[PDB]
């Protein structure tokens, strides 16, 4: 079950210098970087597309604002059961042992995005890496 | 925004794990608001801090240990600080938490964190009357 | 109180240089080394005994071939509730916070073995450390 | 044998969340905390006394303003050869392996202060811990 | 003295999963990523240009071969005294405290490249990031 | 390619620093070739290992400590292993090395590494006659 999955490293990661920490945890679980982009400021269209599912929620504009308030890294990762596993890795701000669990404490500012399903992954990879 | 009371226990000093513990709370973006180093804490304060436990078998050993070496009392502050730092503290069974990664005993478990809004307000008062 | 349990650092830990990482996690939880042996190559029958409850499975041969594909270390750890506590520490590749949860991503190449009960502990210790 | 020395964790360590990192390095070299105080804001005259040998320099005012720009922690560490050993640990922004060498990149915002002699140690301790 | 400098993360870093470790050390010394590229396999022309100074040494072909035997990351870093400081950080396989000092042990396979001068930096940044 | 002899000393076990030490040697890409755990080492072996020091004031305290707790003897292998692992060991003055980061005493200093090709061949023989 070899998969690719899309990871965004969010502006708060850069603010708090947790970028390598975050990538290191994914690296140590043996997943490989397939492609990678650094955006000093992400084009607002990309961000809007990326969180399209949310275009209606009341947190949509604040979220876009924040996602654009600093650098982000978009990463395509590959490995056995990648989508599911990098999601567990991402975790949530409640449970320790995870990226969010250990280093994040905000509903908006939570360091990392990881695709949550087979479809969202294909989608998200084409948004950030259109060249396939 | 919330505040909570953390105690670094004597085993933490014994085992040179003080920075490791504080570091974990630091990495989850919680901020120190007050801090005191007690080379040895007054048994009075301990018994207050653990007053709800005054009727248990373990009560006297607890206090004995709690005055067996230094402790640091810290007031932390951040969003949802009380329950998040509590989840961080964890227990000796759950790896990923402080106790889960570093502690192996029912008594010597490195850290105390307030477990409710009331406990916090009261414990803070105990350790930081001012 | 005190128990002793048997741990194996598997060949993948050597290949991936996670020997110290694994051992460090058991060390930071306050467990002590009572015995320890480094095997550049473990004799096959030791492996086969160690996994004897597993001899009828389909995976049995490949497992043994893997366990013989590089160095292993056998360690007897001692501590309160050591068997159960070191088992949780090992965890599984689905559980962030544990050894396999953070560092392994494979059904067979999962870094570490830990005894799962009092009897298997006593049995496994006598296999790697028969001189007692 | 035993010496005590005075350490300050400067405001930049709080802003950058390196308080535990700094203290950990001193802890891993086996030095012990004898006294310790957290100041959300250090009174200015304490800072000025602490840096009194520095009062005629051009940088004197900005230094003091910085030291007052956030929390600091004053710590008395005790250990063999503590004054000299903790000084080397602090190092400088040019020397990899030390605190400033790995984590600081600035003439003024350099994370940590350590006493540089027996006399300054005795003097600085009496400033932050006059109750003795 | 604000500077940009060019860093390459070499294939051995990917082999040994030290990528985030290496980047983390630069991050913790407070340098910022200005731009960044991931190359699954670097175009051999780029590598030849990058090590042009060496086109004559007997190690030139082996070096190119190795630089192309796996992924690399090219990074432009910014910060006070960046060229000089990231060079100290890089270090050499003899002295601990550095990236190479702590993690490398080969004259060829040494994890990281960092520009060593103001000119080599301008040059190397234009090779990998021609868009300026 | 070279081989060298490393001893993890009892203070390393006392202070729970065994993985930290081995980990540093592991990260510089050196490989374990033989390893033995001694719960307590025969004073005989120690005195051999430290035979060149048999005439110093510190000699008996040295041996006393060296048999005061467990030790691990390791044979490492890698390019230029003897001098590189020696540089890694360092001394209590030089931060960045093992002793420089973790040790603060002239006797209890966590680790021994062979310091020459001859010392290595001889020390290896001592700890791994086989
Ligand atoms: C629910 C929620 C999400 N967000 C942001 C942060 C989330 O990472 C992002 C997507 O929301 P969500 O899908 O809930 O989180 P996840 O990334 O774990 O799937 O939207 C807010 O800013 N406010 C909110 O109330
Ligand atoms: C249950 C129990 C607690 N204790 C001590 C350790 C605990 O930190 C303290 C309070 O107990 P408890 O509230 O059970 O644990 P926690 O600290 O997680 O709230 O009392 C013992 O010494 N022995 C025991 O059997
Ligand atoms: C279940 C399973 C295990 N194994 C190997 C890896 C396991 O570590 C070992 C023992 O299996 P198991 O008891 O399932 O895991 P563990 O005891 O380690 O928690 O057998 C396979 O190779 N294939 C398999 O399908
Ligand atoms: C030399 C210098 C120091 N400082 C500040 C930072 C130093 O930590 C502090 C004391 O100066 P100094 O004694 O040079 O450094 P330290 O004692 O910390 O090794 O004064 C400046 O702000 N500007 C300067 O030019
Ligand atoms: C000297 C030397 C360098 N190299 C490779 C590795 C070096 O990183 C690269 C450039 O050489 P050099 O300029 O000596 O190293 P640095 O990157 O520290 O400036 O060439 C060899 O493969 N063999 C050699 O003998
Ligand atoms: C010089 C000295 C060494 N020793 C011990 C610690 C050393 O590890 C051991 C050998 O000494 P030495 O060769 O000086 O140090 P190293 O271990 O770096 O080669 O003897 C003392 O106990 N006291 C002393 O004064
Ligand atoms: Mg979602
Ligand atoms: Mg309770
Ligand atoms: Mg089992
Ligand atoms: Mg000075
Ligand atoms: Mg050069
Ligand atoms: Mg010597």
A73 touches chain E (CB under 8 A): yes
The DSSP code for E53 is G
Find the B17 Cα to ligand 10 centroid distance in Å.
30
Residue nearest (by alpha carbon) to ligand 2 atom 14: B106
Residues in the 5 Å CB sphere of ion ligand 11: E 116
A92 touching C (Cβ < 8 Å): no
Full strand arrangement of the beta sheet holding E72-80: A112-114, A2-9, A72-80, A32-39, E32-39, E72-80, E2-9, E112-114
Q: Is the CB of E63 under 6 A from ligand 5?
A: yes
Q: Which residues of E carry a binding-site annotation?
A: 10, 59, 87, 100, 110
The backbone torsions φ and ψ at residue D3, rounded to the nearest 5 degrees and listed phi first, read -135, 160
Q: Which among B69, F34, F29, A110 is positioned nearest to F7, based on CA atoms? A: F34
Q: Are F4 and F81 in contact (CB under 8 A)?
A: yes
Whether residue B15 lies within 8 A of chain F, CB to CB, comes out as: yes
Q: Which tokens in the block code for residue E11?
A: 């294939």
Q: How far is the CA of C3 from the centre of ligand 2 (A)?
A: 22
Name the fold adopted by F1-130: Alpha-Beta Plaits (3.30.70)
CATH among 3.40.710.10, 2.102.10.10, 3.90.180.10, 3.30.70.141 for A1-132: 3.30.70.141
How close D90 comes to chain F (CA, Å)? 9
Phi, psi of C123 (to 5 degrees): -65, -55
From the list C84, C94, C89, C90, the residue with the least C-alpha distance to C121 is C84
Pick the closest to residue D88 from D114, D127, D61 (CA basis): D114
B70 contacts in D (CB within 8 Å)? Answer: 33
> Is residue D100 lining ligand 4, measured as CB closer than 6 Å?
no
Domain boundaries, chain E: 1-132
Smallest CA–CA separation between A49 and chain E, in Å? 23
For residue E49 the two structure tokens come to: 């240009």
Technique behind the model: X-ray
Cross-chain CB nearest to D80 (options F96, F101, F105)? F105
Report resolution (Å) to 1 decimal. 2.6
In the Cβ-directed half-sphere of E43, how many Cα atoms lie within 13 Å?
6
Taking the CA of residue F25 and the nearest CA in chain C, the distance in Å comes to: 9
Query: 3-state DSSP call for residue B55?
Result: coil
Atom of ligand 3 nearest to the CA of C62: 22
Asked if C97 contacts A25 with a C-beta cutoff of 8 angstroms, the reply is no
Q: Among residues E31, C62, B97, D52, which one has the least CA distance to residue A101? A: B97
Instruction: Tell me how far apart the alpha carbons of residues B20 and B12 are, in angstroms, rounded to a whole number.
Output: 9
- Chain C CB within 8 Å of residue B97 CB: yes
Buried b (16+ CB within 10 A) or exposed e, A93-130: bebbbbbbbbbbbeeebbbbbbbeeeebbebbbebbbe
User: Which residue CA neighbors atom 17 of ligand 1 most closely?
Assistant: A113
Distance B62 CA to ligand 2 centre (A): 8
């Amino acid at each position: 079950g070899l998969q690719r999955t899309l990871v965004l490293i969010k502006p708060d990661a850069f603010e708090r210098s947790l970028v390598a920490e975050i990538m290191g945890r994914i690296e140590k679980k043996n997943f490989k970087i397939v492609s990678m982009k650094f955006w000093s400021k992400a084009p607002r269209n990309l961000i809007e597309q990326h969180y399209k599912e949310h275009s209606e929620q009341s947190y949509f504009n604040d979220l876009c604002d924040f996602m654009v308030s600093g650098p982000i890294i978009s990463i395509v990762y590959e490995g056995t059961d990648a989508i599911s596993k990098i999601r567990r890795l991402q975790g949530n701000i409640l449970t320790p042992g995870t990226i969010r669990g250990d280093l994040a404490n905000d509903i908006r500012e939570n360091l990392i995005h990881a695709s949550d399903s087979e479809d969202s992954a294909v989608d998200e990879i084409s948004i950030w890496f259109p060249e396939t």
